[PDB]
Structures are given as structure tokens and as C-alpha cells.
């Protein structure tokens, strides 16, 4: 019966969600719980870099009004 084709599809599927969940949590871990900034245009890289200089060395650390 067709249901036997499912085992194979399942294994494919599980192996196609891993990548999307993986890439989207190894980003939120490396960037400090905040989505990796996407610097499409320089302004953004500038702002990002500015952030680095503002604190520690990493941009993800984010200083606030209390600074």
C-alpha cells in the first residue's frame, strides 16, 4: 500500500527542515539572541561597525539609554 512510500519521504523531510531550523538558530546563538544583522548596504555595515566600537568588540552586545 502507498503508506510504505512514506517512510522514505519522512526521512527526506526531516532532512530538509534541519537545515532551515539549524541555520536559523546557529545565527541566533552566535549573534547573541538577536538576528544576525543583514548589511545589504554600507549604511548598515557602518551602523553595525559603529555598534562594535560602541561596546566590547562584538556588535551584538548592545548598550542602551543607560550609557
Amino acid at each position: 500500500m502507498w503508506f510504505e512510500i512514506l517512510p522514505g519521504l519522512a526521512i527526506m523531510g526531516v532532512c530538509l527542515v534541519i537545515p532551515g531550523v539549524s541555520t536559523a538558530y546557529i545565527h541566533k546563538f552566535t549573534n547573541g539572541g538577536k538576528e544576525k544583522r543583514v548589511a545589504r548596504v554600507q549604511y548598515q555595515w557602518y551602523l553595525m561597525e559603529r555598534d562594535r566600537r560602541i561596546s566590547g568588540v562584538n556588535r551584538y552586545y548592545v548598550s542602551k539609554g543607560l550609557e
Binding site: 512510500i5 526521512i11 546557529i26 545589504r40
Partner: protein, 317 residues
């Protein structure tokens, strides 16, 4: 961590490649009143790993008349480009997001036509050269409409970055609009992966050309490449035209639906293969240059006009 991510994208995809083969050998089976492979392993799950090991062990044969590089470069290039094109894909977050992402996918696909050309010249037997020349032609032709169909899309997306479409398709799939091209993207995706309705690249009844002189490890690498592509192109359909629901709070329902739509459209080309006879070489090009290219070029203009007079010019960025 980046490597971890590199591994998370390539290893799973490769495993998915393997099981697609199994799934192709069971869905085609049940459609043809047969169980398909279930005896090796449980329900045939170990079947893809089994022939992989048989293929690598069997002696790779270097024909007396064969280049030894345009022969080994060709499968390496085929696997390298196909696995590479999974690098910049929104799921929803891309591993390496590139501002000109779709141009990367179009360019990387284009390079695979060489592998066919190089393998055909390398074999130095008539069946291989005739097959390669027709093949390169098919692939290249189905690139000209393939590219124009994307340019129509982009102009309604605003950018070349595949990441933008997740924000373009937050209210409706790009199938509703632009369905006429989806179909034409789907048929072109069927040609570029040399799948059935368009499998003349390597017709079996016709020239049993691409892998004629390729056995064991070289056979496998292209082989792997084709199937990974089979997925990738289907996945590009599932981002560009069928936009999976995106919620910024939970990113995986995007990937969960990406999983569901990709599998169904991957299932569709499996279903297409069993259902249709293969087109003639000229019948194939007759479709693209006569039936599709005039439709695509005109609908291309409609997609430069729809934005302007409907005051809908898309926001860059």
C-alpha cells in the same frame, strides 16, 4: 559554528538526495501497481545507501580513448555547483545571504552545462558527443526563458536577493499573480534537471550520452548532483512562487511549510516522469523558442508595465 552550519546544510541535503532516489523508486512503483524496493532494510530505507556502496566499489572505467581530466572534472563540477547552490537559499534565513542572490543561482546553474559538454568530449565515443551537443542545446535554450521568467519575478520583488521574497509573499503567494510563469518555470525546471518529459539529454531508448562512458564513482557524483538539483529547483519554486508563511517570532513554520511545498513539487516531477512520454529533440526546442519565449518576452513587458501604471513600483531593499 559556521562550519557546524555548513555541515547542517550540506549533510542533510545530501541525505535527502539519497532518499529522493528511494522515494522515486516507490512512488513510481505504486503508480505502476508494484511495491517498489522494500526488501533491503525496513521499507527500503537502507536501499539508497546500498547501491551507493555498490557503485563506489565497482571499477571506474577509463575508456582507452578518454581525457582523464575533462572526465574527472565533470562529475566534481556537477556535484560542486548543485550542492553550492544550496548555500544562498532563504529557509527562511540563508547561510550566506547575498544581495544579488538570484543572479548567483542563475549563474551557478549555467556552469553545469559545461560538465555535460566536457563529459561528452572526454568520452571520445560517438554516442557521447551526439548526446552532449543536443544536451547542451537543451539546457542552454531552457536557460534563456528560465532567466527571463526570473527577471519578470524580480521586477515585482524589487531586488535580486532571494531573502526579499519572504517579505514580498507575506500576504499572497506569487503564484496567484504570475501563475502563467510558474507553469513556465515549472516546465523549465523540468528541462534543466533533465527529468522526464525532457530527458533527451540522456534518452535511454535514444542513445542509452551523458553517462555512457560513466560508471561507478563518476556516475554517482553527477547522479547525486542531478537529484540534489531536482530538489533545489523545486525549492526555488517553493520560495519564488509558492511563498511559505513567515512568522518572525517562530522561523521554523517557514521551514516546515518550505519542507511541505518542496516535497510536494519534488513529488510532482516524479509523478510527471511516470505519466508522460518523452518529447522529441526538436519538439522540445519548438516548445521553448516558439511556444514559451514569445509568451515570456511579452509577459516580461507586462511585468515592467504592471508596476508603473498600477503605481506599484516595488521598494528597493
Amino acid at each position: 559554528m559556521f562550519f557546524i552550519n555548513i555541515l547542517t546544510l550540506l549533510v542533510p541535503i545530501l541525505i535527502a538526495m539519497a532518499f529522493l532516489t528511494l522515494v522515486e523508486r516507490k512512488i513510481l512503483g505504486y503508480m505502476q501497481l508494484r511495491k517498489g524496493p522494500n526488501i533491503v532494510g525496513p521499507y527500503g530505507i537502507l536501499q539508497p545507501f546500498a547501491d551507493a556502496m555498490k557503485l563506489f566499489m565497482k571499477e571506474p572505467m577509463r575508456p582507452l580513448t578518454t581525457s582523464m581530466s575533462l572526465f574527472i572534472i565533470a562529475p566534481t563540477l556537477s556535484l560542486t555547483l548543485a550542492l553550492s547552490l544550496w548555500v544562498p537559499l532563504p529557509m527562511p534565513h540563508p547561510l550566506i545571504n547575498l544581495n544579488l542572490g538570484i543572479l548567483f543561482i542563475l549563474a551557478t546553474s549555467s556552469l553545469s552545462v559545461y560538465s555535460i559538454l566536457w563529459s561528452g568530449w572526454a568520452s571520445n565515443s560517438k554516442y557521447s558527443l551526439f548526446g552532449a551537443l543536443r544536451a547542451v542545446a537543451q539546457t542552454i535554450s531552457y536557460e534563456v526563458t528560465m532567466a527571463i521568467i526570473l527577471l519578470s519575478v524580480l521586477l515585482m520583488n524589487g531586488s535580486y536577493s532571494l531573502q526579499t521574497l519572504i517579505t514580498t509573499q507575506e500576504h499572497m503567494w506569487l503564484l496567484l499573480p504570475a501563475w502563467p510563469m510558474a507553469m513556465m518555470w515549472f516546465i523549465s525546471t523540468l528541462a534543466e534537471t533533465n527529468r522526464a518529459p525532457f530527458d533527451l539529454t540522456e534518452g535511454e531508448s535514444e542513445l542509452v550520452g551523458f553517462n555512457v562512458e560513466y560508471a561507478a564513482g563518476p556516475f554517482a557524483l553527477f547522479f547525486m548532483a542531478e537529484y540534489t538539483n531536482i530538489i533545489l529547483m523545486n525549492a526555488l519554486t517553493t520560495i519564488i512562487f509558492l511563498g511559505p508563511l513567515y512568522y518572525i517570532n517562530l522561523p521554523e513554520l517557514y521551514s516546515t511549510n518550505f519542507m511541505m511545498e518542496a516535497l510536494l513539487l519534488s513529488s510532482t516531477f516524479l509523478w510527471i516522469r511516470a505519466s508522460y512520454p518523452r518529447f522529441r529533440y526538436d519538439q522540445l526546442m519548438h516548445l521553448l523558442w516558439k511556444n514559451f519565449l514569445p509568451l515570456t518576452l511579452a509577459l516580461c513587458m507586462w511585468h515592467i508595465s504592471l508596476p508603473i501604471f498600477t503605481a506599484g513600483v516595488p521598494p528597493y531593499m
